[PDB]
Amino acid sequence: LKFPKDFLWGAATAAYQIEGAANEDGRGPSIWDTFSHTPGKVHNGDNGDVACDHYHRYKEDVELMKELGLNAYRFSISWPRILPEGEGKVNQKGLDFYNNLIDELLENGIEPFVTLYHWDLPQALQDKGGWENRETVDAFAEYARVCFERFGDRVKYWITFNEPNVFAVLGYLSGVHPPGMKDLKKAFRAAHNLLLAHARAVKAYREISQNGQIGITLNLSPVYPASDNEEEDKAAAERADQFNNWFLDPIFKGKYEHMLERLGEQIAANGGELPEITDEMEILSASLDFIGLNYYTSNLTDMGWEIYPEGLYDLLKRIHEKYNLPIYITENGMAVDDEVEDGAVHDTNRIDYLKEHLEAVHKAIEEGVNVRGYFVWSLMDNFEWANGYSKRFGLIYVDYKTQKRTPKKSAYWYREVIKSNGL
Ligand code: HEM
Ligand SMILES: [Mg+2]
């Protein structure tokens, strides 16, 4: 099973999950700094102040990427590390770090695959409403333009938002993620501003006219756990179904030109309050060079062992057949209760997970689906949001007391997969 000629072999991370240095070098706080320092919001009281200390250890981490032989590396830029208040003064040391990361990746032949927004909205913007406030759209447009001007000369692949469908549900409907709302009308309002923000970032990208591609990331198969009181999960599940069904409308499913109008009219229905739209609709008519898919499991509770690589194949066909755009598997991986035993981590079940999902990807590719890349989640164990560090997704084990990286068995297997360009 060989893969296309210039296929992207990579792994993915996100800024707040690995970087650390949360309160150093001019970085402003994100809502996840606020959230993880509030009692009872994150497992075991974990936070990402230190995380993997990737901010300080990136050269060692890139060296391990080179040992794995990664074509590309997907990461996110920390918005409050570039703009501590989300807008205005640019943090110089924050630019230096990402400029250094990008040069170090290119020096070793790893292509940056850069997410603008991976959920670390600057708290200052959240103080005045976050995505409920149209000014956050203004700030995301400026912040997107800033990364395009400082880094766009070396980054070829950009992602505006990572899973805006998941963030909307978790942060505005079930309230398990910041800003912790359980309100459907607020979620539609935030989704609307998120839509404008994406289009204005896409607009800003084409005005700078760099020869690269910009897209979005979606998790069309989201799975949410069962809390510990069923009444709220019922109310959160019912709010989520109303929100998801709205975006899965049979006649206007992927047509985001009409989605913005219907959304603003639906906002106008219950609340009104809708400001002018410059040209976003004609941007959202064709807003993507590629679509990134984040696949972990399928919706059809689990016992623990069930993997659904057949569902990733099914998703790949139907997305390809309906939207006819290049597809990147921007995230795929499995959490395992990993331990280090005599310098090794035998995560063979993770090897079986990735192996089965890759032959599903190869099946889609053989039937014409234009899959251009694959990224394991994650490159290393990291801060798994509200689960804290209790969930290890990495190809590389991180011992958080010593910050030592130990490549798991899955890392050596993946190196052989990349070297063969297939299975
Ligand atoms: C503000 C940003 C966005 C939000 C909040 C959002 C929201 C959603 C939601 C809730 C779903 C359904 C999730 C599920 O399947 O359970 C969805 C599906 C989808 N979204 Fe969006 N979306 C956004 C941007 C976009 C854009 C800009 C595009 C493409 C130009 C896009 C393409 C799709 C596609 C292809 C699907 C799958 C629809 C299908 O089943 O045919 N999304 N989105
Ligand atoms: Mg073994």
Residue numbers in the entry: 9 to 308, 328 to 450
Quote the authors verbatim:
Family 1 glycosidases (GH1) commonly function as β-glucosidases and β-galactosidases, although other activities are also found in the family. We focus on a putative ancestor of modern bacterial and eukaryotic enzymes and find a number of unusual properties that clearly differentiate the ancestor from the properties of its modern descendants. Unexpectedly, the ancestral glycosidase binds heme tightly at a well-defined site in the structure with concomitant allosteric increase in enzyme activity.
Besides interactions with several hydrophobic residues, the bound heme interacts with Tyr264 of α-helix 8 (as the axial ligand), Tyr350 of α-helix 13, Arg345 of β-strand B and, directly via a water molecule, with Lys 261 of β-strand B, although this latter interaction is only observed in chain A. The bound heme shows B-factor values similar to those of the surrounding residues, it is well-packed and 95% buried. Indeed, the accessible surface area of the bound heme is only 43 Å2 compared to the ∼800 Å2 accessible surface area for a free heme. As observed in modern heme-binding proteins, the ancestral heme-binding pocket is enriched in hydrophobic and aromatic residues and propionate anchoring is achieved through interactions with arginine, tyrosine and lysine residues. Heme binding clearly rigidifies the ancestral protein, as shown by fewer missing regions in the electronic density map, in contrast to the structure of the heme-free protein. Lastly, we note that the heme is located near the enzyme active site (at about 8 Å from the catalytic glutamate at position 171) but does not have direct access to this site as revealed in the structure. Therefore, the increase in activity observed upon heme binding is an allosteric effect likely linked to dynamics (see “Discussion”) since heme binding does not substantially alter the position/conformation of the catalytic carboxylic acids nor the residues involved in substrate binding according to the static X-ray structures. It is therefore safe to assume that our heme-bound ancestral glycosidase contains iron in the +3 oxidation state. By contrast, heme appears at about 8 Å from the catalytic Glu171 in our ancestral glycosidase.
